[PDB]
Amino acid sequence: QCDVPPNSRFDCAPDKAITQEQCEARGCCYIPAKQGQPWCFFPPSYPSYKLENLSSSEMGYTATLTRTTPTFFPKDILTLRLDVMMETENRLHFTIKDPANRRYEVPLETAPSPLYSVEFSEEPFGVIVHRQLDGRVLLNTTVAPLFFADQFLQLSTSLPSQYITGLAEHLSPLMLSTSWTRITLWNRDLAPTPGANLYGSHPFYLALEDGGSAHGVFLLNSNAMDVVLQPSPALSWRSTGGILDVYIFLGPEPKSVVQQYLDVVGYPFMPPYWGLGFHLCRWGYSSTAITRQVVENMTRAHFPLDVQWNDLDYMDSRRDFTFNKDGFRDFPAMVQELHQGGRRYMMIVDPAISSSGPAGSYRPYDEGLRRGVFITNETGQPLIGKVWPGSTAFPDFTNPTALAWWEDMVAEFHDQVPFDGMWIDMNEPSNFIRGSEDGCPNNELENPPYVPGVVGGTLQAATICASSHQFLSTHYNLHNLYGLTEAIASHRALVKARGTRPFVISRSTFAGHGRYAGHWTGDVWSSWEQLASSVPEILQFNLLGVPLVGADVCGFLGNTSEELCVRWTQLGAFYPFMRNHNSLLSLPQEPYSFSEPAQQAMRKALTLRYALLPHLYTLFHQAHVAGETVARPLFLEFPKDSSTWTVDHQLLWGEALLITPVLQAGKAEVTGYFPLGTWYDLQTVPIEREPAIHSEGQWVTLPAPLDTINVHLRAGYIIPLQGPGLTTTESRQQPMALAVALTKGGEARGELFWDDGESLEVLERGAYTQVIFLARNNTIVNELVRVTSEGAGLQLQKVTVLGVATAPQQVLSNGVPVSNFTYSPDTKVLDICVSLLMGEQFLVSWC
Ligand SMILES: *[C@@H]1O[C@H](CO)[C@@H](O[C@@H]2O[C@H](CO)[C@@H](O[C@@H]3O[C@H](CO)[C@@H](O)[C@H](O[C@H]4O[C@H](CO)[C@@H](O)[C@H](O)[C@@H]4O)[C@@H]3O)[C@H](O)[C@H]2NC(C)=O)[C@H](O)[C@H]1NC(C)=O
Numbered sequence: 001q002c003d004v005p006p007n008s009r010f011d012c013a014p015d016k017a018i019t020q021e022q023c024e025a026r027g028c029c030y031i032p033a034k035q036g037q038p039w040c041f042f043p044p045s046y047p048s049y050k051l052e053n054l055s056s057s058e059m060g061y062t063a064t065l066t067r068t069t070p071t072f073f074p075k076d077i078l079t080l081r082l083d084v085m086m087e088t089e090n091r092l093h094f095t096i097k098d099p100a101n102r103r104y105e106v107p108l109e110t111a112p113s114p115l116y117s118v119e120f121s122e123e124p125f126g127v128i129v130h131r132q133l134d135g136r137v138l139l140n141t142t143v144a145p146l147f148f149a150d151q152f153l154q155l156s157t158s159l160p161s162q163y164i165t166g167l168a169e170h171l172s173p174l175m176l177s178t179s180w181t182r183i184t185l186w187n188r189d190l191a192p193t194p195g196a197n198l199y200g201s202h203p204f205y206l207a208l209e210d211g212g213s214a215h216g217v218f219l220l221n222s223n224a225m226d227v228v229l230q231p232s233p234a235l236s237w238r239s240t241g242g243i244l245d246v247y248i249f250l251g252p253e254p255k256s257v258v259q260q261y262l263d264v265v266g267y268p269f270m271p272p273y274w275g276l277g278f279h280l281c282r283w284g285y286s287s288t289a290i291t292r293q294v295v296e297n298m299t300r301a302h303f304p305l306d307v308q309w310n311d312l313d314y315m316d317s318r319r320d321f322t323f324n325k326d327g328f329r330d331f332p333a334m335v336q337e338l339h340q341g342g343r344r345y346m347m348i349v350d351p352a353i354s355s356s357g358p359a360g361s362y363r364p365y366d367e368g369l370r371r372g373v374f375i376t377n378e379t380g381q382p383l384i385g386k387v388w389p390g391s392t393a394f395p396d397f398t399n400p401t402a403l404a405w406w407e408d409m410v411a412e413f414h415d416q417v418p419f420d421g422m423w424i425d426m427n428e429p430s431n432f433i434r435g436s437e438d439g440c441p442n443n444e445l446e447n448p449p450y451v452p453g454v455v456g457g458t459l460q461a462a463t464i465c466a467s468s469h470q471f472l473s474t475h476y477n478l479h480n481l482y483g484l485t486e487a488i489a490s491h492r493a494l495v496k497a498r499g500t501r502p503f504v505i506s507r508s509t510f511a512g513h514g515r516y517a518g519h520w521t522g523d524v525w526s527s528w529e530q531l532a533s534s535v536p537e538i539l540q541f542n543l544l545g546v547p548l549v550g551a552d553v554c555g556f557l558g559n560t561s562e563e564l565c566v567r568w569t570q571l572g573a574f575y576p577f578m579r580n581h582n583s584l585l586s587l588p589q590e591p592y593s594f595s596e597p598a599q600q601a602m603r604k605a606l607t608l609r610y611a612l613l614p615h616l617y618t619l620f621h622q623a624h625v626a627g628e629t630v631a632r633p634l635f636l637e638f639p640k641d642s643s644t645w646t647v648d649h650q651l652l653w654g655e656a657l658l659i660t661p662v663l664q665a666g667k668a669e670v671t672g673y674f675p676l677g678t679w680y681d682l683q684t685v686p687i688e689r690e691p692a693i694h695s696e697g698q699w700v701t702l703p704a705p706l707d708t709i710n711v712h713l714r715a716g717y718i719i720p721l722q723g724p725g726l727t728t729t730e731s732r733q734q735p736m737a738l739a740v741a742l743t744k745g746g747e748a749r750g751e752l753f754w755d756d757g758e759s760l761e762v763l764e765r766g767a768y769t770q771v772i773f774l775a776r777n778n779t780i781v782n783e784l785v786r787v788t789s790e791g792a793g794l795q796l797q798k799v800t801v802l803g804v805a806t807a808p809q810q811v812l813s814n815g816v817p818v819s820n821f822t823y824s825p826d827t828k829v830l831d832i833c834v835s836l837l838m839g840e841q842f843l844v845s846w847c
Pocket residue numbers: 377378379381382383384438439440
């Protein structure tokens with residue numbers, strides 16, 4: 001009965017420190033570890049639920065689950081309903097609910113044979129999901145008891161391997177440790193550090209299977225939760241409320257798992273083109289005059305800058321929807337001038353609204369009070385916390401009236417200052433005091449029978465009371481959606497205020513956030529450790545459908561070094577969202593504030609990113625239309641090479657661009673993994689050391705002096721490029737170029753998506769140009785998928801072909817010898833001058 005292998009023991013005392021006698025009285029096994037592993041664990045006979053009256057339906061199964069012996073938690077739900085829905089060949093969906101009471105549910109919009117088969121264990125109850133093709137057991141919930149109590153759900157499963165990623169937001173390797181790891185999902189304001197619940201919660205994992213197939217599991221549950229991983233290997237979901245709403249995504253390819261997950265939670269939003277340019281911010285740009293000098297200093301030193309930002313500086317006494325009449329007296333003129341120069345403007349918005357101002361003197365509060373927009377306490381009055389302005393009320397973004405109020409406050413402020421998006425901070429929501437000015441009542445929501453592993457050991461720590469009232473439910477159920485609901489509110493407000501694509505960057509997130517907004521990783525230290533950690537974290541958010549993600553380039557807290565800021569700018573130029581942001585008390589870290597050689601390296605990083613923008617924009621189009629990742633781990637692109645599985649200090653842009661950054665001080669080289677194939681050094685492509693790495697799938701040491709970041713182009717791919725500019729307003733008017741990386745057999749393929757860069761409903765209206773590029777048998781051609789006014793008249797002026805073994809005797813464009821070409825025998829690069837249009841069929845040939 002108690003003869004269970006150490007790694008397969010599930011904790012029978014997750015709630016408290018227990019003695020042997022108490023453990024044995026619960027009906028559990030007490031065996032101390034020999035040095036973590038639970039001492040008190042479930043025998044195989046521990047009372048679970050029994051399956052009864054299993055019945056078949058069109059599109060699935062239903063059953064009753066019955067528990068006859070109570071658990072050690074209060075309020076077991078003794079009778080449950082199981083619903084199994086076989087939704088698509090790729091997507092299995094099951095719920096476990098209380099048939100006698102509607103419980104809290106997360107608000108979410110909804111040869112021939114499935115990839116899965118499903119079976120059930122009768123007693124103890126379990127759901128068993130096989131991969132049909134190879135019989136692999138993906139889900140087996142029979143491994144531990146089902147707990148289903150009012151404030152405690154636990155469902156466990158075997159894992160198919162030791163390789164599992166997901167369960168944001170935490171500072172972790174991309175692949176999570178199965179060594180008795182407790183991962184806590186409770187949105188929390190805390191500087192990224194390992195083992196802590198951070199700003200967001202994504203209850204989704206992708207699990208790798210031997211051979212390179214994968215599946216995903218989504219628990220649609222927004223309650224405070226722990227996820228416990230153990231080395232058997234196995235996983236336990238432990239939630240403090242709601243229901244069990246489980247999706248299984250059968251892949252079989254890791255890229256298909258992510259797409260299938262995003263079919264449920266939403267495809268990433270399409271950002272404006274300008275959103276992919278460089279962003280520059282700090283706390284301490286304390287006047288329009290200082291803020292204007294940033295743009296002047298960047299422009300003087302030839303550094304691209306699309307978007308100037310301000311932090312709290314612009315506000316009147318740190319209040320939303322105000323600007324002070326000292327340093328920011330001419331705020332509106334500053335933003336209009338930025339626009340005249342072809343730049344955009346972003347500023348910080350906090351959720352909490354100053355509640356202490358004289359009545360009638362501060363419209364956001366006064367109108368919020370009138371319309372009942374705020375989270376309320378026991379007596380129906382606004383819950384009052386403390387944030388930057390002092391005493392504050394907290395908008396309830398589940399209240400439709402709050403959405404209307406937020407739209408009005410954003411539109412009215414935009415009529416004063418035409419800002420181009422919203423930086424939504426502190427939306428955990430973050431509170432400077434515990435719960436409220438008035439503390440919190442003593443009830444089961446504030447003091448629940450199971451408290452997950454949250455920093456501070458309470459649901460109230462750094463946030464508002466758990467028993468506070470929102471339109472849809474208590475904050476207890478809704479806390480992990482606070483940031484997401486604000487992001488939805490802000491997305492709609494910006495659409496109504498500006499009539500073009502919204503640009504929202506949010507601190508706090510939940511599953512499906514990417515449908516509305518991007519994310520930055522928060523208060524990272526200016527350290528080599530946090531630079532290195534930003535790579536796994538940016539990859540993790542791409543797997544979770546938030547591709548518009550980055551870290552504060554050169555780090556946020558503390559003082560950067562020139563060397564760290566060179567390496568951080570080099571790597572950060574490959575963040576899909578690229579912003580340099582800096583704390584109030586920090587030494588300056590704008591590119592122009594460093595030595596001449598450091599400026600050259602930073603300018604080169606920005607030049608290359610701007611040259612690549614048409615490509616990065618096309619990668620976002622694929623994310624938006626097909627649920628693809630933008631920045632992706634090697635294992636997503638080469639899952640059948642098991643050597644890629646633990647690589648998280650390299651990243652790809654899409655299928656073709658491999659980035660191998662230096663992430664350590666004092667290094668003049670970097671060792672990176674190169675999947676099987678040829679990888680061309682991007683340094684061999686002209687933009688305004690081995691030329692090719694021929695890998696069998698192996699580790700390769702690369703020269704990486706201070707002025708270099710290693711970037712390689714995969715053979716068989718074509719990348720569109722565009723000429724330079726200090727803004728995308730300038731760069732989008734330049735001639736374009738192609739970089740063509742030939743296979744040994746002379747083949748390559750690539751594409752370009754182009755639209756006006758900011759309109760709504762572009763794909764629905766067909767207001768875009770889509771072109772495919774094909775290299776074959778010493779020819780390059782375009783294939784016109786769609787050609788419209790927007791994209792017709794893009795000029796192709798340069799074609800660079802990599803892996804051309806022999807100097808050609810002649811190079812033809814549309815049957816005429818070209819004006820000019822060069823061939824380099826040492827690099828195998830053929831550089832061709834042309835006068836072609838992306839939107840008009842061409843043929844470039846050489847021999
Ligand atoms: C729900 O939220 C509301 C706010 O929307 C919150 O109202 C607050 O209630 C407390 C009382 O519990 C108020 O505090 C009082 O403030 C007045 C005037 O500003 C003071 O003079 C009062 O002093 C008396 O009580 C003291 C206790 O420390 C005594 O020592 C003293 O001698 C006085 O007898 C007292 O501090 C507070 O003003 C309001 N806040 C606002 C914004 O009106 C309400 O309490 C919340 N409900 C729950 C159950 O949490």
